[PDB]
Coordinates of C-alpha atoms and ligand atoms in Angstrom, one line a residue:
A1 CA -23.5 -54.8 8.5
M2 CA -20.2 -53.4 7.7
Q3 CA -17.1 -53.8 6.0
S4 CA -13.8 -55.2 7.7
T5 CA -9.9 -55.9 7.3
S6 CA -7.4 -58.1 8.8
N7 CA -6.4 -54.8 11.2
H8 CA -9.1 -52.2 10.6
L9 CA -12.9 -52.0 10.5
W10 CA -15.6 -49.7 9.7
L11 CA -19.3 -49.0 9.5
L12 CA -21.0 -48.1 6.2
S13 CA -23.1 -45.5 8.0
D14 CA -20.2 -43.3 9.3
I15 CA -19.2 -42.3 6.0
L16 CA -17.0 -39.4 5.5
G17 CA -16.1 -38.5 1.7
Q18 CA -17.5 -39.8 -1.0
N19 CA -15.0 -43.9 -0.7
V20 CA -13.9 -42.6 2.7
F21 CA -15.3 -44.5 6.0
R22 CA -14.2 -43.4 9.6
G23 CA -12.9 -46.6 10.8
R24 CA -11.3 -48.1 13.5
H25 CA -8.5 -50.8 14.4
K26 CA -9.1 -53.9 15.7
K27 CA -6.4 -54.3 18.0
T28 CA -6.1 -50.8 19.5
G29 CA -9.4 -48.7 18.9
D30 CA -7.7 -45.8 17.4
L31 CA -9.6 -44.6 14.8
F32 CA -8.1 -44.1 11.4
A33 CA -9.9 -42.8 7.5
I34 CA -10.2 -45.7 5.5
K35 CA -10.2 -45.0 1.7
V36 CA -12.1 -48.2 0.1
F37 CA -11.5 -48.0 -4.1
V38 CA 1.9 -50.5 -10.5
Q39 CA 0.3 -49.2 -7.7
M40 CA 2.3 -51.3 -5.0
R41 CA 5.6 -48.6 -5.7
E42 CA 3.4 -45.2 -6.0
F43 CA 1.5 -45.9 -2.5
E44 CA 4.4 -47.6 -0.6
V45 CA 6.3 -44.2 -1.8
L46 CA 3.8 -42.4 -0.5
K47 CA 3.9 -44.3 2.9
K48 CA 7.3 -42.5 3.8
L49 CA 5.9 -39.0 3.2
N50 CA 5.9 -37.4 6.5
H51 CA 5.4 -33.9 7.2
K52 CA 3.1 -31.6 9.2
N53 CA 1.2 -30.2 6.6
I54 CA 0.4 -33.8 4.7
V55 CA -2.1 -36.3 5.9
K56 CA 0.4 -39.6 6.8
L57 CA -0.8 -42.7 5.1
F58 CA -0.1 -45.3 7.2
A59 CA -0.7 -48.3 5.5
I60 CA -2.0 -50.2 2.6
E61 CA -4.6 -53.3 3.0
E62 CA -6.9 -55.8 1.0
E63 CA -10.6 -55.9 2.0
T64 CA -12.1 -59.2 3.4
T65 CA -15.0 -59.8 1.3
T66 CA -14.4 -57.7 -2.1
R67 CA -10.3 -58.0 -1.6
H68 CA -10.2 -54.1 -2.4
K69 CA -6.9 -51.9 -2.3
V70 CA -8.1 -50.0 1.3
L71 CA -5.9 -47.3 2.1
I72 CA -5.2 -46.9 6.4
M73 CA -4.7 -43.3 6.5
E74 CA -4.7 -40.7 9.3
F75 CA -8.1 -39.7 10.4
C76 CA -9.1 -35.9 10.8
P77 CA -12.2 -35.3 12.9
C78 CA -12.7 -31.4 12.5
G79 CA -13.0 -32.3 8.3
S80 CA -11.8 -30.2 5.4
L81 CA -11.2 -26.3 4.9
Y82 CA -14.6 -26.6 2.8
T83 CA -16.5 -27.7 6.0
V84 CA -14.7 -24.8 8.0
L85 CA -15.9 -22.0 5.1
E86 CA -19.1 -23.7 5.5
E87 CA -19.7 -21.9 9.1
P88 CA -21.5 -19.0 9.3
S89 CA -18.8 -17.3 11.1
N90 CA -16.8 -17.6 7.7
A91 CA -18.9 -17.0 5.4
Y92 CA -17.7 -13.7 5.1
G93 CA -13.8 -14.5 5.3
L94 CA -11.8 -16.4 8.0
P95 CA -10.4 -15.1 10.9
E96 CA -7.0 -13.5 10.3
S97 CA -5.4 -15.9 12.8
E98 CA -6.9 -18.8 10.9
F99 CA -6.1 -17.8 7.3
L100 CA -2.1 -17.2 8.2
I101 CA -2.2 -20.9 9.6
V102 CA -4.1 -22.1 6.6
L103 CA -1.2 -20.2 4.3
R104 CA 1.3 -21.4 6.4
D105 CA 0.3 -24.9 6.0
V106 CA -0.7 -24.6 2.3
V107 CA 3.1 -23.3 1.5
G108 CA 4.7 -25.3 3.9
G109 CA 3.1 -28.7 2.4
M110 CA 3.1 -27.9 -1.4
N111 CA 7.0 -27.1 -0.8
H112 CA 7.8 -30.3 0.4
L113 CA 5.8 -32.0 -2.5
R114 CA 7.6 -29.9 -5.0
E115 CA 10.8 -31.1 -3.0
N116 CA 9.6 -34.7 -3.6
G117 CA 8.1 -33.4 -7.0
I118 CA 4.1 -34.3 -6.7
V119 CA 2.4 -31.8 -8.7
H120 CA -1.5 -31.2 -7.1
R121 CA -3.5 -29.0 -9.5
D122 CA -6.6 -29.7 -8.3
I123 CA -6.4 -27.9 -4.8
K124 CA -9.2 -27.0 -3.4
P125 CA -10.6 -26.1 0.3
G126 CA -11.9 -29.9 -0.3
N127 CA -8.6 -31.3 -0.4
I128 CA -7.3 -29.4 2.5
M129 CA -7.9 -31.3 6.1
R130 CA -7.9 -29.8 9.2
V131 CA -6.8 -31.3 12.4
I132 CA -6.4 -29.8 16.3
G133 CA -2.5 -29.9 17.0
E134 CA -1.3 -30.6 20.7
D135 CA -1.5 -26.5 21.2
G136 CA -5.0 -26.1 20.7
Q137 CA -4.6 -24.2 17.2
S138 CA -5.5 -25.7 13.7
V139 CA -3.2 -27.7 11.5
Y140 CA -4.3 -28.0 7.6
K141 CA -3.0 -31.0 5.5
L142 CA -3.1 -32.0 1.8
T143 CA -4.3 -35.5 1.3
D144 CA -6.0 -36.1 -2.5
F145 CA -3.2 -36.3 -5.2
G146 CA -9.4 -30.5 -11.4
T147 CA -12.8 -29.0 -9.9
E148 CA -15.1 -27.3 -11.9
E149 CA -14.5 -24.1 -9.8
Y150 CA -10.8 -24.1 -9.4
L151 CA -9.7 -24.5 -12.8
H152 CA -7.3 -22.7 -15.2
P153 CA -8.7 -21.0 -18.1
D154 CA -6.3 -23.4 -20.3
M155 CA -7.7 -26.3 -18.2
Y156 CA -11.1 -25.0 -18.3
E157 CA -11.1 -26.6 -21.9
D158 CA -0.6 -24.9 -10.7
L159 CA -0.9 -21.9 -8.9
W160 CA -4.2 -21.0 -9.8
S161 CA -6.6 -23.2 -7.5
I162 CA -4.4 -21.7 -4.7
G163 CA -5.2 -18.3 -5.3
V164 CA -8.7 -19.1 -5.9
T165 CA -8.5 -20.9 -2.6
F166 CA -6.9 -18.4 -0.8
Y167 CA -9.5 -15.5 -2.2
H168 CA -12.5 -17.7 -1.2
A169 CA -10.7 -18.1 2.5
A170 CA -10.4 -14.5 3.1
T171 CA -13.6 -13.0 1.9
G172 CA -16.1 -16.3 2.4
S173 CA -17.3 -16.3 -0.9
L174 CA -15.7 -16.9 -4.6
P175 CA -14.0 -14.7 -7.1
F176 CA -15.1 -15.6 -10.1
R177 CA -19.2 -15.7 -9.6
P178 CA -21.9 -15.0 -12.4
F179 CA -25.1 -14.6 -11.7
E180 CA -27.0 -17.9 -11.6
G181 CA -24.0 -19.4 -10.5
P182 CA -21.4 -21.4 -12.0
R183 CA -24.0 -23.9 -13.5
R184 CA -26.4 -22.4 -16.3
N185 CA -24.1 -19.4 -16.3
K186 CA -20.9 -21.8 -16.9
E187 CA -19.9 -19.8 -20.4
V188 CA -20.3 -16.8 -18.6
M189 CA -17.4 -18.4 -16.1
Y190 CA -15.2 -19.0 -18.7
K191 CA -15.8 -15.5 -20.5
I192 CA -15.0 -14.2 -17.3
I193 CA -11.4 -15.8 -16.7
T194 CA -10.7 -15.4 -20.2
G195 CA -11.8 -11.5 -19.6
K196 CA -8.0 -11.5 -17.8
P197 CA -8.0 -8.0 -16.6
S198 CA -4.4 -8.5 -15.4
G199 CA -4.6 -7.0 -11.9
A200 CA -8.0 -7.4 -10.7
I201 CA -8.9 -10.3 -9.1
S202 CA -12.5 -10.3 -8.8
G203 CA -15.7 -9.8 -11.0
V204 CA -18.9 -10.3 -9.9
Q205 CA -22.4 -10.8 -12.3
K206 CA -25.0 -9.0 -10.1
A207 CA -27.7 -9.5 -13.1
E208 CA -28.5 -12.1 -15.2
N209 CA -26.4 -12.1 -18.3
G210 CA -25.3 -8.4 -17.2
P211 CA -21.9 -6.6 -17.0
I212 CA -18.8 -8.1 -14.4
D213 CA -17.8 -6.0 -12.2
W214 CA -14.3 -5.9 -11.5
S215 CA -12.1 -5.2 -8.5
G216 CA -8.6 -5.7 -7.5
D217 CA -8.7 -4.8 -4.1
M218 CA -10.2 -7.4 -1.3
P219 CA -14.4 -6.4 -0.8
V220 CA -15.0 -4.5 2.5
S221 CA -16.4 -7.6 4.0
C222 CA -13.0 -8.9 4.3
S223 CA -12.3 -9.9 7.8
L224 CA -8.4 -9.3 7.4
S225 CA -6.6 -6.1 8.4
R226 CA -5.8 -3.3 5.6
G227 CA -2.1 -4.2 5.7
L228 CA -2.9 -7.7 5.3
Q229 CA -4.5 -6.9 2.5
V230 CA -2.0 -4.6 1.5
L231 CA 0.8 -7.2 1.3
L232 CA -2.1 -9.9 0.3
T233 CA -3.4 -8.2 -3.1
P234 CA -0.3 -8.8 -5.1
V235 CA 0.6 -12.3 -4.5
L236 CA -2.8 -13.0 -5.5
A237 CA -3.2 -10.5 -8.5
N238 CA 0.1 -11.8 -9.9
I239 CA -1.0 -16.0 -10.3
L240 CA -4.4 -15.0 -11.6
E241 CA -3.5 -14.6 -15.5
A242 CA -3.5 -17.2 -18.3
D243 CA -0.5 -15.6 -19.2
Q244 CA 2.6 -17.8 -18.6
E245 CA 4.9 -15.0 -19.5
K246 CA 3.2 -13.2 -16.6
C247 CA 3.0 -15.8 -13.8
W248 CA 5.5 -15.9 -11.3
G249 CA 6.1 -19.8 -10.4
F250 CA 6.8 -21.4 -7.5
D251 CA 9.9 -19.9 -6.6
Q252 CA 8.5 -16.0 -6.8
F253 CA 5.3 -17.5 -4.7
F254 CA 7.1 -19.4 -2.0
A255 CA 9.5 -16.3 -1.6
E256 CA 6.9 -13.7 -1.4
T257 CA 4.5 -16.0 0.7
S258 CA 7.5 -16.5 2.8
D259 CA 8.1 -12.9 2.9
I260 CA 4.4 -12.5 4.5
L261 CA 4.7 -15.1 6.8
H262 CA 7.9 -13.7 8.6
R263 CA 6.6 -10.5 9.5
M264 CA 5.3 -9.7 13.1
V265 CA 2.3 -8.0 14.2
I266 CA 2.3 -4.5 15.5
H267 CA -0.9 -3.1 16.9
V268 CA -1.4 0.6 16.3
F269 CA -4.8 2.3 16.6
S270 CA -5.2 6.1 15.3
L271 CA -6.8 7.5 17.7
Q272 CA -7.4 11.1 15.9
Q273 CA -9.1 8.9 13.1
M274 CA -10.3 6.4 15.4
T275 CA -8.8 3.3 13.2
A276 CA -7.3 0.2 14.5
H277 CA -4.3 -0.9 12.4
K278 CA -1.9 -4.0 12.4
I279 CA 1.5 -3.2 10.9
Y280 CA 3.1 -6.5 9.4
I281 CA 6.7 -6.1 9.5
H282 CA 9.5 -7.9 9.7
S283 CA 11.6 -8.7 13.1
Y284 CA 14.7 -7.0 11.9
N285 CA 13.3 -3.6 10.3
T286 CA 14.0 -0.5 11.7
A287 CA 11.6 2.0 13.3
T288 CA 12.1 4.4 10.3
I289 CA 10.1 1.7 8.2
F290 CA 7.5 1.2 10.9
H291 CA 6.6 4.4 10.4
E292 CA 6.5 4.4 6.9
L293 CA 4.1 1.5 6.9
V294 CA 2.0 3.7 9.9
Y295 CA 2.1 6.3 7.2
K296 CA 1.0 4.4 4.2
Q297 CA -1.6 3.2 6.1
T298 CA -2.8 6.4 8.0
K299 CA -1.2 9.1 6.1
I300 CA 0.2 10.4 9.2
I301 CA 3.7 12.2 8.7
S302 CA 6.4 10.1 10.2
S303 CA 7.8 13.0 11.9
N304 CA 4.4 13.9 13.3
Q305 CA 3.8 10.6 14.7
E306 CA 3.7 10.5 18.3
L307 CA 3.1 7.4 20.2
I308 CA 1.5 6.2 23.4
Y309 CA 2.0 3.0 25.0
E310 CA 0.4 1.6 28.4
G311 CA -0.5 5.1 29.6
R312 CA 2.9 7.0 29.0
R313 CA 5.0 8.5 25.9
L314 CA 6.6 6.3 23.8
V315 CA 10.0 7.3 21.9
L316 CA 10.7 4.8 19.0
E317 CA 14.6 5.6 17.8
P318 CA 14.8 4.9 14.1
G319 CA 17.4 2.1 14.2
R320 CA 15.9 0.2 17.1
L321 CA 14.5 -3.1 15.4
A322 CA 10.9 -4.3 15.9
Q323 CA 11.3 -7.5 17.4
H324 CA 12.3 -5.3 20.6
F325 CA 9.2 -3.3 20.4
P326 CA 7.0 -3.8 23.7
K327 CA 4.4 -6.6 22.7
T328 CA 1.2 -5.7 21.7
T329 CA -2.5 -6.8 21.3
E330 CA -5.4 -6.2 19.9
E331 CA -6.8 -4.2 23.7
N332 CA -3.4 -2.9 24.3
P333 CA -1.8 -1.0 21.0
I334 CA 0.5 1.5 20.5
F335 CA -1.9 4.8 20.1
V336 CA -0.5 7.0 17.4
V337 CA -1.5 10.9 17.6
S338 CA -0.1 13.7 15.6
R339 CA 0.2 17.7 15.7
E340 CA -2.2 18.2 12.5
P341 CA -6.0 18.2 12.3
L342 CA -6.8 14.9 11.3
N343 CA -10.4 13.8 10.3
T344 CA -12.7 11.6 12.3
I345 CA -13.5 8.5 9.8
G346 CA -14.2 5.7 12.4
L347 CA -15.0 2.1 11.2
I348 CA -15.8 1.3 7.6
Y349 CA -17.4 -1.8 6.7
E350 CA -20.0 -2.9 4.0
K351 CA -23.8 -2.2 5.1
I352 CA -25.8 -5.6 4.5
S353 CA -29.6 -6.2 5.2
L354 CA -31.8 -8.8 5.9
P355 CA -32.4 -11.0 2.9
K356 CA -36.3 -11.6 2.4
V357 CA -37.4 -15.2 3.6
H358 CA -39.3 -17.3 1.0
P359 CA -42.3 -19.0 1.9
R360 CA -42.1 -22.2 -0.4
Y361 CA -41.2 -25.5 1.7
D362 CA -37.9 -26.0 -0.3
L363 CA -35.2 -28.1 1.9
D364 CA -32.4 -26.8 -0.2
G365 CA -33.3 -23.5 -0.9
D366 CA -34.3 -23.3 3.2
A367 CA -30.8 -24.6 3.5
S368 CA -28.7 -21.8 1.1
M369 CA -31.1 -19.0 2.9
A370 CA -30.5 -20.4 6.3
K371 CA -26.8 -20.2 5.6
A372 CA -26.9 -16.8 4.0
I373 CA -28.8 -14.8 6.6
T374 CA -26.6 -16.5 9.5
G375 CA -23.7 -15.6 7.8
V376 CA -25.2 -11.9 7.7
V377 CA -26.1 -12.0 11.1
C378 CA -22.5 -13.2 12.0
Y379 CA -21.1 -10.2 10.3
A380 CA -23.2 -7.9 12.2
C381 CA -22.1 -9.7 15.4
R382 CA -18.3 -9.1 14.5
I383 CA -19.2 -5.2 13.5
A384 CA -20.7 -4.9 16.8
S385 CA -17.9 -6.0 18.7
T386 CA -15.7 -4.5 16.9
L387 CA -17.6 -1.1 17.4
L388 CA -17.4 -1.6 20.9
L389 CA -13.8 -2.8 21.0
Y390 CA -13.1 0.8 19.4
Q391 CA -15.2 2.5 21.8
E392 CA -13.0 0.9 24.8
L393 CA -9.6 1.9 22.7
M394 CA -10.7 5.2 22.3
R395 CA -11.7 5.7 26.2
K396 CA -8.4 4.4 27.2
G397 CA -6.6 6.6 24.5
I398 CA -8.4 9.5 25.5
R399 CA -8.0 8.7 29.6
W400 CA -4.6 8.2 28.7
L401 CA -3.8 11.6 26.4
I402 CA -5.4 13.9 28.8
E403 CA -2.6 12.5 31.5
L404 CA -0.2 13.0 29.0
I405 CA -0.8 16.5 28.4
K406 CA -0.9 17.4 32.0
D407 CA 2.4 15.6 32.3
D408 CA 3.6 18.3 29.6
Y409 CA 1.8 20.9 31.9
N410 CA 3.8 19.9 34.7
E411 CA 7.4 20.3 32.9
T412 CA 6.0 23.4 31.8
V413 CA 5.7 24.3 35.5
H414 CA 9.5 23.2 36.1
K415 CA 10.7 25.8 33.6
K416 CA 8.4 28.1 34.6
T417 CA 9.7 28.1 38.7
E418 CA 13.2 27.9 36.8
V419 CA 12.3 31.2 35.6
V420 CA 10.7 32.7 38.4
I421 CA 13.6 32.3 40.8
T422 CA 16.2 33.7 38.5
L423 CA 13.6 36.4 37.7
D424 CA 13.4 37.5 41.3
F425 CA 17.0 36.6 42.1
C426 CA 18.3 38.9 39.4
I427 CA 15.5 41.8 39.5
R428 CA 16.3 42.5 43.0
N429 CA 20.1 41.8 43.1
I430 CA 20.5 44.8 40.8
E431 CA 17.9 46.6 43.3
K432 CA 20.7 45.9 46.1
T433 CA 22.9 48.3 43.8
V434 CA 20.6 50.9 43.2
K435 CA 19.9 51.7 46.8
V436 CA 23.4 52.9 46.8
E437 CA 24.7 55.9 34.7
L438 CA 21.2 55.9 35.2
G439 CA 20.1 54.7 32.2
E440 CA 21.6 51.3 32.3
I441 CA 19.8 50.6 35.0
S442 CA 16.6 52.2 34.2
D443 CA 16.5 50.4 30.8
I444 CA 17.1 47.1 32.5
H445 CA 14.2 47.7 34.9
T446 CA 12.1 48.9 31.7
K447 CA 13.0 45.6 30.2
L448 CA 13.0 43.6 33.4
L449 CA 9.0 44.4 34.7
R450 CA 8.0 43.4 31.0
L451 CA 9.6 40.0 31.5
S452 CA 7.5 39.6 34.6
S453 CA 4.5 41.1 32.9
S454 CA 4.5 38.4 30.5
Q455 CA 5.6 35.9 32.6
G456 CA 2.4 36.6 34.6
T457 CA 0.3 36.4 31.5
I458 CA 1.9 33.0 31.0
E459 CA 1.2 32.2 34.9
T460 CA -3.0 33.0 34.1
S461 CA -2.9 31.2 31.0
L462 CA -1.5 28.0 32.1
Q463 CA -3.8 28.2 35.4
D464 CA -6.7 28.4 32.7
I465 CA -5.3 25.2 30.7
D466 CA -5.1 23.6 34.3
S467 CA -8.9 24.5 34.9
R468 CA -9.2 22.8 31.8
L469 CA -7.7 19.7 32.6
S470 CA -9.9 19.5 35.6
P471 CA -12.9 17.4 36.2
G472 CA -15.6 19.1 34.0
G473 CA -13.5 22.0 32.5
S474 CA -14.8 21.4 28.9
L475 CA -12.2 18.7 28.1
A476 CA -12.7 16.2 30.7
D477 CA -13.4 12.4 29.3
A478 CA -16.3 11.7 31.2
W479 CA -18.8 12.1 28.0
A480 CA -17.0 9.3 26.5
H481 CA -17.8 6.9 29.9
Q482 CA -21.8 8.5 29.3
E483 CA -22.2 8.0 25.3
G484 CA -21.4 4.9 23.5
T485 CA -21.6 1.1 24.1
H486 CA -20.1 -0.6 27.3
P487 CA -19.3 -4.0 28.2
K488 CA -21.9 -3.5 30.9
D489 CA -24.8 -3.4 28.3
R490 CA -23.5 -6.5 27.2
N491 CA -24.6 -6.4 23.3
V492 CA -22.0 -8.6 21.5
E493 CA -23.5 -11.2 23.6
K494 CA -27.0 -10.1 23.5
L495 CA -26.4 -10.7 19.3
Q496 CA -24.8 -13.9 20.5
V497 CA -27.7 -15.8 21.9
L498 CA -29.5 -15.1 18.7
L499 CA -26.9 -16.2 16.8
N500 CA -26.7 -19.4 18.5
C501 CA -30.2 -20.0 17.9
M502 CA -30.0 -19.2 14.4
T503 CA -27.1 -21.2 14.1
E504 CA -28.5 -24.4 15.5
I505 CA -31.6 -23.6 13.3
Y506 CA -29.1 -23.4 10.2
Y507 CA -27.7 -26.9 11.2
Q508 CA -30.8 -28.4 11.8
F509 CA -31.9 -27.5 8.2
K510 CA -28.5 -28.7 6.9
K511 CA -29.9 -32.2 8.5
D512 CA -33.0 -31.8 7.3
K513 CA -31.5 -31.2 3.3
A514 CA -29.8 -34.3 3.6
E515 CA -32.9 -36.3 4.0
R516 CA -34.8 -36.0 1.2
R517 CA -38.2 -36.0 2.3
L518 CA -39.6 -35.3 6.4
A519 CA -42.3 -36.7 7.8
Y520 CA -45.2 -34.7 9.1
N521 CA -44.4 -33.7 12.5
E522 CA -41.0 -33.0 11.4
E523 CA -42.1 -30.9 8.4
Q524 CA -44.1 -28.6 10.9
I525 CA -40.9 -28.6 13.3
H526 CA -38.9 -27.2 10.2
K527 CA -41.5 -24.3 8.9
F528 CA -42.0 -23.5 12.5
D529 CA -38.2 -22.9 13.6
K530 CA -38.2 -21.3 9.9
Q531 CA -40.4 -18.9 10.6
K532 CA -38.5 -18.5 14.2
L533 CA -35.1 -17.8 12.3
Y534 CA -37.1 -14.7 10.6
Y535 CA -38.3 -13.5 14.0
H536 CA -34.4 -14.1 15.4
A537 CA -33.4 -12.1 12.7
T538 CA -35.3 -9.2 12.7
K539 CA -34.8 -9.0 16.3
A540 CA -31.0 -8.7 16.0
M541 CA -31.1 -6.5 13.7
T542 CA -33.2 -4.0 15.3
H543 CA -31.0 -4.6 18.4
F544 CA -28.1 -4.0 16.3
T545 CA -29.1 -0.5 14.0
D546 CA -31.2 0.8 16.9
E547 CA -28.8 0.5 19.8
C548 CA -25.1 -0.4 18.9
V549 CA -25.0 1.8 15.8
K550 CA -26.7 4.9 17.0
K551 CA -24.6 5.0 20.1
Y552 CA -21.0 4.4 18.4
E553 CA -22.3 7.2 16.0
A554 CA -22.9 9.6 19.0
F555 CA -20.0 8.5 20.3
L556 CA -17.9 9.2 17.2
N557 CA -19.5 12.8 16.6
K558 CA -18.6 13.6 20.0
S559 CA -15.2 12.4 19.6
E560 CA -14.7 14.5 16.4
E561 CA -15.6 17.8 18.3
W562 CA -13.6 16.4 21.4
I563 CA -10.6 16.0 18.9
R564 CA -10.8 19.8 18.1
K565 CA -10.9 21.1 21.2
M566 CA -7.8 18.6 22.1
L567 CA -5.8 19.8 19.4
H568 CA -6.5 23.3 20.1
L569 CA -5.5 22.7 23.7
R570 CA -2.4 21.3 22.8
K571 CA -1.3 24.2 20.5
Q572 CA -1.8 26.7 22.9
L573 CA 0.2 24.4 25.5
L574 CA 3.0 24.1 22.8
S575 CA 2.7 28.0 22.3
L576 CA 3.0 28.6 26.0
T577 CA 5.9 26.5 26.6
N578 CA 7.6 28.0 23.6
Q579 CA 7.0 31.5 25.1
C580 CA 8.5 30.1 28.3
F581 CA 11.9 28.7 26.6
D582 CA 12.4 31.9 24.4
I583 CA 12.4 34.2 27.8
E584 CA 14.7 31.5 29.6
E585 CA 17.2 32.5 27.5
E586 CA 16.1 36.4 27.2
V587 CA 16.9 36.8 30.9
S588 CA 20.2 34.8 30.6
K589 CA 21.4 38.1 28.4
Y590 CA 20.5 39.8 31.3
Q591 CA 21.9 38.0 34.0
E592 CA 25.7 37.7 33.1
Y593 CA 25.4 41.9 31.4
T594 CA 25.4 44.6 34.3
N595 CA 25.2 42.0 37.0
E596 CA 28.8 41.5 36.2
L597 CA 30.7 44.8 35.8
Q598 CA 34.7 45.1 35.0
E599 CA 37.1 46.8 37.3
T600 CA 40.4 45.9 38.9
Ligands
E0S701 C1 -18.8 -34.2 8.1 C2 -18.1 -33.6 9.0 C3 -18.5 -33.6 10.0 C4 -16.4 -34.5 8.6 C5 -16.2 -35.0 10.2 C6 -14.7 -35.4 10.4 C7 -14.2 -36.3 9.3 O1 -12.8 -36.9 9.0 C8 -11.8 -37.1 7.8 N1 -10.8 -37.8 7.8 C9 -10.1 -37.8 7.0 N2 -8.7 -38.2 7.1 C10 -10.5 -37.2 5.5 C11 -9.5 -37.8 4.8 O2 -8.1 -37.8 4.4 N3 -9.9 -37.5 3.1 C12 -11.2 -37.0 2.5 N4 -12.1 -37.7 2.9 N5 -13.4 -37.1 1.9 N6 -12.6 -35.8 1.6 N7 -11.3 -35.8 1.7 C13 -11.6 -37.1 5.5 C14 -12.4 -36.9 6.7 C15 -13.9 -36.3 6.5 O3 -14.4 -36.0 5.6 C16 -14.7 -35.7 7.9 C17 -15.9 -35.1 7.8

């Protein structure tokens, strides 16, 4: 039993959205999204609507048995944005690149709809479908053109649900949540929106009939980079208040969003702070503004920013455009160091624990619980891989920094030889004439011998530093390989195994919730795997805090000491080379003084 048309057919079991059925064409076999329910104009005008971010309405037919108006639309095997947000890997926010894709498609689609003049208003993650492009990345489209959670305070009685959708995608949770959720606390919801704190974007009621925790910045669990949060906070803040006097409008919205989308990414890893950062800078900006953003994200003075890339010093000309910078990834960034002592902070993340498991056999409660806990383990896996990444970037940055310091030492050796050759060829060229009026030479020797003495002290204090830049010389990078975690331990994948187990159990509970009840056998399987879920999560957190976190903190403290040692050595070597330059010119005051007398 199924429904058919002149060109398409569909089964009622393959139901998509509740109606829209997953159908096929009678002559080609290609799958289509079949929609089964003045019109003949407003639909044919929707036929011509062609865009990358718009679900192409293919045709309009009439069903066989009921003669209903059936819409032949494009099929999207992946689902909607809401389906993507239901996965545990996005329970605390989408990945950064995926978020940029969502923003680009949403803006690029709504701009086309405004060029054609179609207001959507009800724009939720359920109205944004996701397909797979020919390149592999996702492509999001609009289709159905409000919802109880995405309504405007005045409509609750256009740029609002867009902001709520962007916050939901960036943080994994809704911006305005009462205690018992937007259900019986619905009035609180209204009181939360009419509280319009202007700039703030978040308000969480963490107690029944309690207060509302307001916030203007994104939560710590947000997986976006700090720079992307800096550029994203005002865009949401200015489109989330009931005042039409203080609303941006689509012109300012599209302008600022287009400003964000046109910025290339520069990966910069603060080594002395052990903190990774992404600088969003246009391709036409100069390196001065780049140092400005690096300062605004790391508090490092622009003139003190010394950059390292691929094992070499990197000098950025203040006028060099950003698009001509070397291409950098998350695993091959541009290390920034400074001569000023910097505090060793490390990674900042939200420390979440395991929510307790309930014994009540509840097909809905076990589903929501499994979703929450699996999202927690996903966050623990993300932070685990991020800590491993910070440790490896730390090892590469240190192993490069020691070689850079040794290069500076080698240049100091060059200048030292330049001073020694002149010192000898000027202290003995005078003794050539002495062995043939006495104060003019005695003073010279009493100064040149001082020069050779202090120069010798520089030699000893230099060979001491070369002894410090040797293996095991109270400055070797050997402890970094023998402290924190490594990809050899395979901790990220060790957590990802239990993550796949808990994800399979979660999906099976998602299938068990659709069924209103289970048989006895399937019930006992549901309970057994419900306990195995708790065992998997407990083992995962045990392996996370008692192996990844401890090693990371040991490596971090050790790094905090080695940073002090390295800064000390850098100041010493700088002082020594400076004591090699000012005496390089002090021997220039004597090489031309008496060695060249005046006589016809
Ligand atoms: C249940 C999930 C796995 C899934 C898989 C494929 C899907 O494939 C779709 N392909 C479309 N073209 C539209 C659509 O155009 N509009 C629409 N339906 N419901 N809400 N919006 C919707 C869907 C789905 O739901 C869907 C879900």
